[PDB]
Design a protein around this ligand. Structure first.
Ligand SMILES: O=C(O)c1ccccc1/C=N/n1c(S)nnc1-c1ccc(C(F)(F)F)cc1
Ligand SMILES: [Ca+2]
Ligand SMILES: [Ca+2]
Ligand SMILES: [Zn+2]
Ligand SMILES: [Zn+2]
Length: 231
């Protein structure tokens, strides 16, 4: 709590001199607020965003918070897979004139998932690293596709010059008792994908994820341990 800022429906937490976490909440009618996290990154004189909020209105609130608190232009956004918690606000980013980037497969699945596709598609080598020509001027964002897990399209992001990596919805916290909704999951490859994310970002000590508070690297090995049990 203490330290967090609220702006409309959203909550913001500073993780590092130039990195903040954004949290938005879906109101599940019977259940109440379900939190989802993304990241905001100040890169010199511009801002980069990872993930939308659940809805367009909430995504607009992120951008307005950036305008109010950082007052630097948002140069691009990258969304980490084609479900509502990470791509629900695409229309808001587009309306705001932010260039948007997603895994090619996310963009291909988006219509069927009821999401709006990003403008640009990222592609990935066999070793999981983004093909650099598809991610121009990403500054410190290092984008890595670990393999199928939470979904087949899930990607992850590390921030150069920080100790932070973002596992999105693939990674659960180190006290988690399950892997959550596995309805679109690849149960066979999940564990290796979790470990691959760990290997991509070997010096990250702060692991940020969609549905828990930032954790140590314990979150990675813990998720992989649970995932091992799906085979
Ligand atoms: O199941 C979990 O792991 C979990 C745990 C805790 C909080 C959220 C989630 C899952 N959120 N989520 C992911 S991750 N990908 N998609 C969705 C989603 C959820 C609801 C809707 C709906 F309610 F609005 F329909 C849509 C998407
Ligand atoms: Ca919409
Ligand atoms: Ca689905
Ligand atoms: Zn999902
Ligand atoms: Zn999620």
């Amino acid at each position: 709590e203490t330290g967090d800022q609220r702006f409309g429906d959203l909550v913001f937490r500073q993780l590092a001199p130039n990195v903040w976490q954004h949290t938005s909440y879906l109101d599940m009618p019977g259940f109440g607020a379900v939190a989802s996290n993304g990241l905001i990154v100040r890169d010199g004189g511009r801002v980069l965003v990872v993930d939308t909020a659940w809805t367009d209105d909430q995504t607009a609130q992120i951008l307005n918070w950036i305008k109010q608190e950082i007052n630097l232009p948002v140069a691009l956004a990258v969304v980490t897979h084609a479900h509502q918690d990470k791509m629900g606000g695409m229309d808001a980013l587009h309306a705001a004139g932010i260039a948007t980037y997603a895994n090619a497969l996310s963009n291909q699945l988006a219509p069927q998932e009821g999401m709006v596709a990003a403008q640009h598609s990222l592609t990935f080598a066999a070793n999981g690293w983004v093909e650099p020509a598809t991610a121009p001027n990403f500054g410190p964002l290092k984008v890595f596709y670990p393999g199928p897990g939470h979904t087949s399209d899930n990607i992850t992001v590390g921030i150069d010059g920080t100790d932070i990596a973002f596992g999105g919805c693939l990674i659960k916290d180190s006290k988690a008792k399950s892997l959550g909704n596995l309805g679109d999951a690849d149960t066979e490859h999940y564990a290796a994908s979790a470990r691959a994310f760990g290997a991509a970002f070997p010096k990250a000590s702060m692991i940020v994820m969609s549905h828990s508070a930032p954790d140590s690297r314990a979150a990675i090995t813990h998720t992989a341990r649970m995932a091992d049990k799906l085979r």
